[PDB]
Design an enzyme around this catalytic site. Structure first.
Site, mmCIF file in Angstrom:
data_model
loop_
_atom_site.group_PDB
_atom_site.id
_atom_site.type_symbol
_atom_site.label_atom_id
_atom_site.label_comp_id
_atom_site.label_asym_id
_atom_site.label_seq_id
_atom_site.Cartn_x
_atom_site.Cartn_y
_atom_site.Cartn_z
ATOM 1 N N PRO A 263 -7.524 6.787 9.502
ATOM 2 C CA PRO A 263 -6.104 6.700 9.920
ATOM 3 C C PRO A 263 -5.229 7.873 9.648
ATOM 4 C CG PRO A 263 -6.660 4.787 8.663
ATOM 5 C CD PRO A 263 -7.874 5.667 8.596
ATOM 6 N N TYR A 264 -5.670 8.743 8.787
ATOM 7 C CA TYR A 264 -4.891 9.815 8.314
ATOM 8 C C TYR A 264 -5.489 11.163 8.633
ATOM 9 C CZ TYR A 264 -2.587 6.011 5.775
ATOM 10 O OH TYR A 264 -1.863 4.821 5.473
ATOM 11 N N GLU A 268 -6.952 12.861 -0.153
ATOM 12 C CA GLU A 268 -7.287 13.750 -1.273
ATOM 13 C C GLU A 268 -8.203 13.140 -2.325
ATOM 14 O OE1 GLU A 268 -3.033 12.142 -2.413
ATOM 15 O OE2 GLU A 268 -4.096 12.492 -0.556
ATOM 16 N N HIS A 292 -3.481 21.397 2.437
ATOM 17 C CA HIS A 292 -2.728 20.267 1.894
ATOM 18 C C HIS A 292 -3.634 19.421 0.968
ATOM 19 C CE1 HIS A 292 0.399 17.047 2.130
ATOM 20 N NE2 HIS A 292 -0.648 16.284 1.915
ATOM 21 N N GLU A 293 -4.801 19.039 1.445
ATOM 22 C CA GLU A 293 -5.659 18.254 0.634
ATOM 23 C C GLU A 293 -6.138 18.979 -0.641
ATOM 24 O OE1 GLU A 293 -5.617 15.218 1.242
ATOM 25 O OE2 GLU A 293 -4.831 15.378 3.270
ATOM 26 N N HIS A 296 -3.377 18.790 -3.325
ATOM 27 C CA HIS A 296 -3.349 17.498 -4.046
ATOM 28 C C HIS A 296 -4.204 17.489 -5.313
ATOM 29 C CE1 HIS A 296 -0.732 14.754 -1.862
ATOM 30 N NE2 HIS A 296 -1.463 14.802 -0.743
ATOM 31 N N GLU A 315 3.910 14.038 -2.373
ATOM 32 C CA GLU A 315 3.796 14.702 -1.065
ATOM 33 C C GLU A 315 4.658 15.958 -0.931
ATOM 34 O OE1 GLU A 315 0.701 12.269 -0.178
ATOM 35 O OE2 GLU A 315 1.378 14.220 0.733
ATOM 36 N N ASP A 372 2.190 0.276 3.423
ATOM 37 C CA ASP A 372 1.702 0.827 4.704
ATOM 38 C C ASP A 372 2.758 0.837 5.775
ATOM 39 O OD1 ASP A 372 -0.835 1.297 3.602
ATOM 40 O OD2 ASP A 372 -1.621 -0.605 4.427
ATOM 41 N N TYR A 380 7.187 13.597 2.866
ATOM 42 C CA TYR A 380 6.571 14.924 3.070
ATOM 43 C C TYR A 380 7.664 15.952 3.302
ATOM 44 C CZ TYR A 380 2.124 12.480 3.656
ATOM 45 O OH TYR A 380 0.963 11.715 3.537
ATOM 46 N N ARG A 560 -6.164 8.336 14.428
ATOM 47 C CA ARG A 560 -5.238 8.980 13.492
ATOM 48 C C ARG A 560 -3.840 8.402 13.802
ATOM 49 N NH1 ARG A 560 -4.599 15.498 12.723
ATOM 50 N NH2 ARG A 560 -3.112 15.481 11.050
ATOM 51 N N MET A 561 -3.170 7.770 12.836
ATOM 52 C CA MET A 561 -1.896 7.052 13.119
ATOM 53 C C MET A 561 -0.837 7.955 13.664
ATOM 54 S SD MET A 561 -1.671 3.925 10.536
ATOM 55 C CE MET A 561 -1.491 4.854 9.166
ATOM 56 N N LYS A 562 -0.817 9.186 13.224
ATOM 57 C CA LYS A 562 0.138 10.188 13.668
ATOM 58 C C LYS A 562 0.161 10.356 15.200
ATOM 59 C CE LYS A 562 1.166 15.065 13.117
ATOM 60 N NZ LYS A 562 0.800 16.293 12.441
HETATM 61 N N1 LIG Z 1 11.244 7.511 2.886
HETATM 62 C C1 LIG Z 1 10.303 7.297 1.970
HETATM 63 N N2 LIG Z 1 9.106 6.629 2.078
HETATM 64 C C2 LIG Z 1 8.323 6.620 1.003
HETATM 65 C C3 LIG Z 1 7.088 5.981 0.897
HETATM 66 C C4 LIG Z 1 6.175 5.812 1.944
HETATM 67 C C5 LIG Z 1 4.906 5.218 1.815
HETATM 68 C C6 LIG Z 1 4.459 4.792 0.581
HETATM 69 C C7 LIG Z 1 3.138 4.217 0.357
HETATM 70 C C8 LIG Z 1 1.995 4.750 1.060
HETATM 71 C C9 LIG Z 1 1.446 5.941 0.621
HETATM 72 C C10 LIG Z 1 0.366 6.507 1.262
HETATM 73 C C11 LIG Z 1 -0.318 5.796 2.261
HETATM 74 C C12 LIG Z 1 0.136 4.539 2.565
HETATM 75 C C13 LIG Z 1 1.271 4.005 1.995
HETATM 76 C C14 LIG Z 1 5.324 5.051 -0.473
HETATM 77 C C15 LIG Z 1 6.590 5.617 -0.338
HETATM 78 C C16 LIG Z 1 8.849 7.346 0.018
HETATM 79 S S1 LIG Z 1 10.482 8.075 0.500
HETATM 80 ZN ZN LIG Z 2 -0.592 14.444 1.062
#
Ligand SMILES: Nc1nc(-c2ccc(Cc3ccccc3)cc2)cs1
Ligand SMILES: [Zn+2]
Ligand SMILES: [Yb+3]
Ligand SMILES: [Yb+3]
Ligand SMILES: [Yb+3]
Ligand SMILES: [Yb+3]
EC number: 3.3.2.6
Length: 607
Positions: A263-264, A268, A292-293, A296, A315, A372, A380, A560-562
């Site tokens: 999904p991503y 990392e 990026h990875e 981490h 992030e 999620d 990020y 990939r969710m993006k």
């Molecule tokens: N606007 C903002 N959103 C967040 C936030 C977004 C997602 C998560 C949890 C998460 C982290 C990574 C993958 C799935 C779910 C925790 C925090 C932090 S500040």
């Molecule tokens: Zn990251």
């Protein structure tokens, strides 16, 4: 306390080690085994504790060679079911005990995707992969499923002998399974303490190729060659990262290229970064994801968010390091181009969510929110923007890199909050407290919307992208003959992507314009996923029916969710494609990753 966990908190007790023994059964789509947790009391007279679980079957709990009482509570929706365990003796502060839990997962585990042979590259063997971040480790094994606790682990995993297992750990050999001649046991050791969300497992017909002194790439045979070339900058990036963060403490840095439903972009997992095969552009152009990875391995894996409310720590600092790695390789002007592109992505996010939406805050309260559902690029890019503003306020990149290295050294092997970070910033920069006190902290950390101030960005590499995008946006019908393939001759792949991002921000464009764009630039031929994604979005939002099959193919042939989420949303919003998009989702839902299936369904209001 961590509002996303039902377990005892770190102030009651702390898991120090996991010894996992398990078997992967593809016929039943279950993992079965024992999780032995070494748990250290943090309080006097500790007599019971509570773990997180989700859709787990528990067979028994053994402490000091005897079975002990336990009870599962009522399910709390996406949080799962708390599991209370009665200890056989009471523990003093710092006393440890080993708790051996016999368990089995559910085929519907939200941590796992199980693939049939026909869903793989090779077509002859099935495949399994995990994704524990944020709170899915509890759907694999009982645990304190909070990033506030860090543990080492060992594991032994029995699999069909034709397959390979890998984990987020150092490989520590393999043996035939003494109880089943059709199986093999793979062994793993993780000697550096980690939060449980970094536990990972893949089982499949995997091959490896060496690409640096401490890196193998792993994939199905069909993708190995391409992956090895795509990620060949890996070791150079690791060396840069070590200069910026201090020593790489993890031993190996391997890469696993997953099936397309991952999904991503990456995950990392220590010693074994997971990446999307959508990175295989052919030209190394999406290597920022690898940077990026790699980053981490310091920001996230060494210094960790205490709860998911503070995810931006993980992030934002990682994106900051990532962009310095790519700045060291390709120049400071490239660093600024990427940074500026990130501000654009932040603008996009704020416009989509709305400027008052709570998921546009940098620090979020996830108490009754499925993490999620909260996920987005805000932590990020709003996080990166904060750090880039601070860099600019406090004397520039060399100064702020000094802070970053000190921060990682300070909080290595620890889990921290935003206030921890801010206190350390004020300590490190105490001679610039007057400067720090100009920052509107409440706005930056706690208010929704765009940040209250925009950093300064060099425009050198962006100007050509803006100039061409503006030509197209301001063109009328009678100007369309003026565009030509020569317009692209001095643009890199990165600039081509930015031209498309600039243009997509102004979508729709007239249908005639989009048709001319394909005629002169042949963007339909481009395999680079980032470029293709933005081009197809541009075409759909401009109501070009010719792009419907292309966008439906991209949305479903990778996961990939993006890419998948916005492609489905755009196809559902275009009346010409609405029915086909909803139908296509419903037909593919069973073959999708469970988390992406859930989120697409929420987006579409279907199922
Ligand atoms: N606007 C903002 N959103 C967040 C936030 C977004 C997602 C998560 C949890 C998460 C982290 C990574 C993958 C799935 C779910 C925790 C925090 C932090 S500040
Ligand atoms: Zn990251
Ligand atoms: Yb006591
Ligand atoms: Yb060993
Ligand atoms: Yb404080
Ligand atoms: Yb004209």
């Amino acid at each position: 306390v961590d509002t996303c966990s039902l377990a005892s908190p770190a102030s009651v007790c702390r898991t120090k080690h996991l010894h996992l023994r398990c078997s992967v059964d593809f016929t039943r789509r279950t993992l079965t085994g024992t999780a032995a947790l070494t748990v250290q009391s943090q309080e006097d007279n500790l007599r019971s504790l509570v773990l997180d679980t989700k859709d787990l079957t528990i067979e028994k709990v053994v402490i000091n060679g005897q079975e002990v009482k336990y009870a599962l509570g009522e399910r709390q929706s996406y949080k799962g079911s708390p599991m209370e365990i009665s200890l056989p003796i009471a523990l003093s502060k710092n006393q440890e005990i080993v708790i051996e839990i016999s368990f089995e997962t559910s085929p519907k585990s939200s941590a796992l995707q199980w693939l049939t042979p026909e869903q793989t590259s090779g077509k002859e063997h099935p495949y399994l992969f995990s994704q524990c971040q944020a709170i899915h480790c509890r759907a694999i094994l009982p645990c304190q499923d909070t990033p506030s606790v860090k543990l080492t682990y060992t594991a032994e995993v029995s699999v069909p002998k034709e397959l390979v297992a890998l984990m987020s750990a150092i490989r520590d050999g393999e043996t035939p399974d003494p109880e089943d001649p059709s199986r093999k046991i793979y062994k793993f050791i993780q000697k550096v303490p980690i939060p449980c969300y970094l536990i990972a497992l893949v089982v499949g017909a995997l091959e490896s190729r060496q690409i640096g002194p401490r890196t193998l790439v792993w994939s199905e045979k069909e993708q190995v060659e391409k992956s090895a070339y795509e990620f060949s900058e890996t070791e150079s990036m690791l060396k840069i990262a070590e200069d910026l963060g201090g020593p790489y403490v993890w031993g190996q840095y391997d890469l696993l290229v997953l099936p397309p439903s991952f999904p991503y972009g990456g995950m990392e997992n220590p010693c074994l970064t997971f990446v999307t095969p959508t990175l295989l552009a052919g030209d190394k152009s999406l290597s920022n994801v690898i940077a990026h990875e790699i980053s981490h391995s310091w920001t996230g894996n060494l210094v960790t968010n205490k709860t998911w409310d503070h995810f931006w720590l993980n992030e934002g600092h990682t994106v900051y390091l990532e962009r310095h790695i790519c700045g060291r390789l390709f120049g400071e002007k490239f660093r600024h181009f990427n940074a500026l592109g990130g501000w654009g992505e932040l603008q996009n996010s704020v416009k989509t969510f709305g400027e008052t939406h709570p998921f546009t805050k940098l620090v979020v309260d996830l108490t009754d929110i499925d993490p999620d559902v909260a996920y987005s690029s805000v932590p990020y890019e709003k996080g990166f923007a904060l750090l880039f503003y601070l860099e600019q306020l406090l004397g520039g990149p060399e100064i702020f890199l000094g802070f970053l290295k000190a921060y990682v050294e300070k909080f290595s092997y620890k889990s921290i909050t935003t206030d921890d970070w801010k206190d350390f910033l004020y300590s490190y920069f105490k001679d610039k407290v007057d400067v720090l006190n100009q920052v509107d902290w409440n706005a930056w950390l706690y208010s929704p919307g765009l940040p209250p101030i925009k950093p300064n960005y060099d425009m050198t590499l962006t100007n050509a992208c803006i100039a061409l995008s503006q030509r197209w946006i301001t063109a009328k019908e009678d100007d369309l003959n003026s565009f030509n393939a020569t317009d692209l001759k001095d643009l890199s792949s990165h600039q081509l992507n930015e031209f498309l991002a600039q243009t997509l921000q102004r979508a729709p464009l007239p249908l005639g314009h989009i048709k001319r764009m394909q005629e002169v630039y042949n963007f339909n031929a481009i395999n680079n996923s980032e470029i293709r994604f933005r081009w197809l979005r541009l075409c759909i939002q401009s109501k070009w029916e010719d792009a419907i099959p292309l966008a439906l193919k991209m949305a479903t042939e990778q996961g990939r969710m993006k890419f998948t989420r916005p492609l489905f949303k755009d196809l559902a919003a275009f009346d010409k494609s609405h029915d086909q998009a909803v139908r296509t989702y419903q037909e593919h839902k069973a073959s999708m990753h469970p988390v992406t299936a859930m989120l697409v369904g929420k987006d579409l209001k279907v199922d």
